[model samples]
Target chain A: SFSKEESREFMAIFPDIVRDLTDAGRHTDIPEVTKRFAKVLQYNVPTGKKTRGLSTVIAYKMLEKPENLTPENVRLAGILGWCVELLQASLLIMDDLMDRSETRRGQPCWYRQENVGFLAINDCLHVESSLYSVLRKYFSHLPCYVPIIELFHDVNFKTNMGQSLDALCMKDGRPILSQFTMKRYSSIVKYKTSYYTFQLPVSLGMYLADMYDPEQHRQAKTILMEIGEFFQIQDDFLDAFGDSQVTGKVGTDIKEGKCSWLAVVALQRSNPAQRQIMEEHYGRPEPESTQIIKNLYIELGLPATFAVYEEESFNIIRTHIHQISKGLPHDLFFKIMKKIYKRDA
Target chain B: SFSKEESREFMAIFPDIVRDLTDAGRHTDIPEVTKRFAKVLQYNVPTGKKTRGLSTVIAYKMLEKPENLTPENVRLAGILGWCVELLQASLLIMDDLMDRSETRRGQPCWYRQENVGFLAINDCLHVESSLYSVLRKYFSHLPCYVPIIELFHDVNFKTNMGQSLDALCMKDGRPILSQFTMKRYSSIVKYKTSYYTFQLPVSLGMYLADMYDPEQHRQAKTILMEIGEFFQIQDDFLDAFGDSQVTGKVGTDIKEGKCSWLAVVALQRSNPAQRQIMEEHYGRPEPESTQIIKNLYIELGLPATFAVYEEESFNIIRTHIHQISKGLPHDLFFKIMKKIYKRDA
Candidate 1:
């Protein structure tokens, strides 16, 4: 039950920090590159659902002593929130550049703005750099600062890997959709979405709170990653079948040849004639006939398959959560998972 | 004087450190994206003159107590020098992407290289993040660490401002045979080249050695910046007039429409007819036409003007160095300046 007001409150704390981070030398006379850099941050950071970022603050509140909600903890949460923004910014900047996306969240993507264009890439660097500056300011005093740094460094590296794999899959064409097993989908989701979107914020908060036990962290990673995978799978299903009015965009995942759960399931269930219909009409953005592919997907029984898969994934996540022992408290993890699982878009 | 052997020795200290920085995440199976990021740093860092970067180590030699040249001091010097490399890498990655430059130092620039293409922007972020990681590792314990952070941050902001100005100047088209006045030229060079190239390394090393007086540091900045300005002016002149064999490439600054000192002087001395000749001839990359522009610079008395400017700039730097009554030593600055000033190419 996150409100827009809460998102704004989280965002209101950032502009000054972003301004300080982007401002070029104290020289009052120079051309202002900082303003341009800050504009990129403003555009990219405010676009998303902001669930992963806000969840860090929620976790902090749940775990730390109530007195720990000091100005310092608030600032630390702001920094952690910014880390989420930067990770998303870095990915979205390049993705827009690669996809030639004209708009994001109903506004011109930073890359599409005048005088920005390709230079948004550099602006992305500035956004990324601000994350470290914010961290160094608040967390350097904490004994766990170095481990937090290591956590971010490690997560960023892994997320980039995930992005790279995703990009390659798109380019090389995911023929393995016909051979899709739960294992392959899990691997793709784990690398492409789970680590950065789920584990990063939770692990970072854990590290900040001085939860240093390796086994505890390992168990937490498993549960959160299961939630991340389930969340993404649900998103894929919604993308294809959900109401356009609710989702606010036409579903083109199949036409764009996206290797989603629905596509894999359809491919796996298809007869020879249904497979031929998919092969011909699947990736045609302006297909002369749309009903053929739609009827083929229906014939392959993907809707019923999707329902069963969704139920099973949810059950798997619930089982993992139930198995959480006397390691890290399961309440905060449960809260985040509940919010993520119930999200419609 | 610096020699090839010294350059090789300086280069030798960095490989292991870079490996550690890039390998901070001990993940055995790194993603292709992370690998691409590491490759960008490896490609972009080695291409430069290595002059301003190495100056930090030379400055340390001048400032450190002889007995303090222990392994620790050497490590600190290496970290400071690598900061310069990181700063340069950050700029070059952005510059190549902006200018659409195809090659740097005889190799495809990082952004243009294979498997990188536009993704080099993210690579630049990774390179930049490594700088902070390295800084924290080496200097987080030092009392002056905050100032060091401030200094580097200031330089990065100024460098970006300079880059924005440079890009704007290029985009505005060739309005000047003579509008590239000494003041404008100095402003560009100061922002674009001097801060990171000259002031950053020396100022960083000074901070590390516990030198924090504002007056002493101000004197160092004033002297070092002027020296850096002169050094860049000489570079512009050399790009046109120096031996190609000595300089490592044929000069293209005039034809590239760069705001070179020679072009500025040519503009200042031009009659209406001479100005028209430049308007027709400048920035045409044709070999014979570029030669004509070079001949125009010679005919307009640029070499003598450049020599006089160089001498005046050097004397100003010398006077500032002599006026520093602060306990900061003066010889290392002199050593760096003399070597740069005396170079023919």
Candidate 2:
């Protein structure tokens, strides 16, 4: 694992970017306004783990030779990483608002924060706006700048499409388990989770290091997407069975009636009686129903199914890694694999 | 001045962009999902006026000599204009949700429509994402691609910053007229309305026509921003006094308690007792309080003041226009000036 020290040093530029990027010239002298803008940047953005952002740095470094990993290159890579982090945080804050989520990373969601209700939507937009600002400010002078900008644009587009699908599935406050399909599940996870969380960081790192080969990205994406899929499957399982304390936020997939992998699979494998019970209990929230859905997932042996799936997917992804990562640094790839394997939160 | 015929043809491409973009490889076969996504796009994006989007096309044509306005240039410029429309629609949808608005362009607001309350936020995001998707699809291979992308990026950043300032001012249905300073009002409008509404359209057109001179843009921006500011001041004026049928909506500037141009000026010129009446009636909703505020605005001669200011600034801007349009057609600029001069809606 890249230690907190490495990330801290890499992330040192975050405050400046947030403060300066949020400036946009209009609020420069409005310290009172910008101060709270910084607070939104600091608070809603999940600073936890920093795993996704840090991995970009690690991957970028690995793509270059020892002599080529110059100070400037490192700084550029670090900026790319922060861009990823900022993008992630922006999405999460928006997600929390659309999901009507109450907390994020153990704190009240920005919308739930005092005097910030409803206005958090605008705050969320400001956060999203800064993603582009950060990318342009740091990466504009690089040869890879256009590619990096395109990558962010593409990722944001795909992620929002995914958010649209996910939101529509459970639209309003009502949830319908009948709409959950394995195909739909994969689509949501791929858009909302896969590309952004995994493919975006790794691909950006590769681009920054001048590894612009389409074949390399194709190979990397294949492996990375598989790992991303497995990662999300594990997340669904955790949401169903993971401890509230461990997860930091309570599991809402079952209650929110999301098209999560476990639930979709359950829908697929269920019998008439079992399906009826699952349908009724799946979308409704309560101690009684939450307990029933979790118990049903276990009784239905979802954990065993996921373990088998995760193990196989992990091995298959590793094989692809070796197949494609010729002359590439394996450190970042391996770090991601380990980090994702049995992640608790 | 862009006729319904021109706008109709322009808007025809919108569905294809929405359908094709929502596909994103993953949802290509999901007709039901894609169809609904298109419905969201159609319902939320305003088709009326086409004033802002059409201006981009008109400006582009004006910047190029007739011989230089080739079929390819015209097509590309048309796309950029659509992108502007998409951005405006996206912002409006989000704004309506935050403002708790009931309708848009004479229909129920997207969020107020059946099964689309909070999900409109995600839909607004989709429209925003399409701005770049359309740009990249049409302009990416051209040399102007980066400039176009950066222009969109910068405009969005500034717009959101302005949005942040505006949203913060009336946060949580609580209005504070004491916070209404002309400085703050200009800051809100300059970033929010001026850049995106006027400067962005004109500049993108100039860029597409290969007139990428900094000096030219600098002069244009000063004039465009002044027009934009006056346009908003008139907007603020009309919001209080114009007929609902003429302006096409019930005015919210009074009850919603905006830091509007009229309100800011009133604050500046009010006597202590007049200020007391404003503080009592400004933010209060109809019918008695709204009438009181309107009477106060007249007693203060705010309408006449705005008319004089508007006329004077228009001339000030028109004089600068000739200095800036040294070798270019002035058709589009004048069209915007005429359209914005005294129009209600």
Candidate 3:
């Protein structure tokens, strides 16, 4: 239903959509409380690029028939996209506070703002609750209401489980490289990164389009998770090697002791001597220590190795999509791959 | 269907209910990660008095037909009670973090524990997701699934709104007394305390028993909110005047700048001179300033004022319950009030 320009149009009203939340955000009796509530809403939620948010809109448009894509259907798709974006912001705000992160989205994290340290925790809660409130506003009376709400809850539940898996790998505020085996790395990536990033966005659009077949969703989850794993490997690869200005985040994976794709693969391939060097240098969190790990990565030829990983992932996912995307729009996954594939940052 | 002793028996199987969640909890293929998860489940989810937890069981028991109360029905109720408790712990952990409190339930708060400082934010999300997983395990096949999920979402939604109102009052780690009017105080009490503490537990039980009447929940909410207001006012009164050894929480309301019932009543009756004393001493975090506020409460005779306020609240709610407890057991509210009424801790 939407071309590239039309997709941009679908994604354009994010602020207008968020504004409607605070329109009824005021309480008749407590203007001061409402003022702060509105402030939190405005500041914490408006920073993302709408990449994940618009995935919902474009995918939903591709999934539904023309008659099914009425003004109401289109409106619900718009709302669900923003809901995903809002949910992401909520998660990131809390994630930044939990991780003690300095910057997110090219600015200071919400927790670092003046007078807004602990308030970030509750403001994340407020931001998350707004997801539900917005869903109920547009979708409550539709048949999709129960399923839509359940989808949000279920996605949130799995995303939290993924976070638990990732956080538990830490040893007293630092990740342990020895624990970053492929088993742990895959679980951490699938649960933490892939579930929300790959599976959740597409599935929200899928469900809104009423494609509730068990087989379809199951296959979609598998394929999207593969794409998600590739996405994060690229993330880890870029974290070690890409331009920080382009990435909008500096590379700290080696020093921070992340179980990133490059690290785990390097560990899998390292000799005893390199293993000793990695053990000594990993997780020290300083420039020289990070230099040792990156030097090892260069010696191991991981950049060219991950270039193969990139190709194998695309080929594997390409076959899976052709086999599994049976009657659905194959262009949906095609568009997604083209959006993120063979790209840096 | 179940007696008071049986209610304790129902509450006794929390470890079992939680164990069932772990049947699927062990999916990471990493035993150490699973071990840490089991530790989080054992540590954070099992504390607390289960006062609110058992409300689900007792309210359901009071409302259900004896013939309809199958063993499966009883098992679900037991599990639901534990879910509520899990939900409560999740809320308290986050609330403790937001409030910067050192202890909860007589020990160091989760965020204050070694190596768990800010990560308690994500730990709370883990706890919250367990509430849903437990429900999905047992209730997804039942007709009650949709409503049960919706109930949890809606309750959490309102509870977040309540906390939003209260957290906005403080400026630079201090509360302004000028913002502590009765209207503001009542709004805070109702949203923050009443909905979750008094209303949510009962309606959850009611929904599980297949009750669908809006008027019934409406009437129940009105009365429970009245009782919730009284409950917190008692909290404020006891904070100022009660035995810290008995309460197990040292009083810091005045120094911490909480807008309690005592302060609202004083502001209502204050002359310019009294207002000046309050403005000077309110948020000082010093013993001398707190001593002055306590002296002002005594001088204003507010303790006696609330002693009568408590009585009026009980009588007013007693009448409300008497009128609304038609076609159901009146003993449910009595059981609840007995759990909370006239208590120091």
Q: What are the per-candidate TM-scores when only chain A is compared?
A: 0.85, 0.90, 0.91
Report the C-alpha lDDT of model 3 over B1-345, residue by residue, as the tens digit: 235787567657876765765656556455554555566667777666666767777777778888978877877887888888877878888887766665666677788888677668877776776787788778887877777777777777667767767666667866777779888899888877787777877887788888878888887787788878888888888878877657655566677677788888988877889889888887677889989988988898887888888777777777777876536567787777767777777
Q: Point out where model 2 deviates above 4 Å.
A: A22-32, A171-174, A269-271, A285-292, A298-312, A319-332, A342-345, B12-32, B171-173, B242-250, B269-274, B284-316, B319-331
Q: Give the TM-score of candidate 3.
A: 0.88
Model 1 clash pairs are B177-B267
Tens digit of per-residue lDDT, candidate 1, span B113-217: 555565565566557656766777777777866677667766765676676555444433453444567777887788888988888888877776777778877
Strongest candidate by lDDT = 2
lDDT of 3 by residue, A46-160 (tens): 6666677778877888888877888767767877888887888889888777656677777778889876877687778778767877776677776667677777767776677
| Reference-based lDDT, residue B317, model 2 | 71
lDDT of 1: 0.69
Please compute DockQ, using alpha carbons, for every candidate against the native two-chain complex. 0.24, 0.55, 0.48
Rank list by lDDT: 2, 3, 1
Interface RMSD of 3: 2.4
Please give, for every candidate in the order listed, the TM-score of chain B alone compared with the true chain B: 0.86, 0.90, 0.90
Worst 10 residues of 1 chain B by lDDT: B168-177
- Evaluate residue B152 in candidate 3 and report its C-alpha lDDT on the 0 to 100 scale: 77
How many collisions between residues are there in candidate 1? 1
> A-chain TM-score in candidate 1?
0.85
Could you give the interface RMSD of each candidate, to one decimal? 3.9, 2.4, 2.4
- Taking the candidates one at a time, how many backbone clashes does each contain? 1, 0, 0
How much does candidate 2 score in TM-score? 0.91
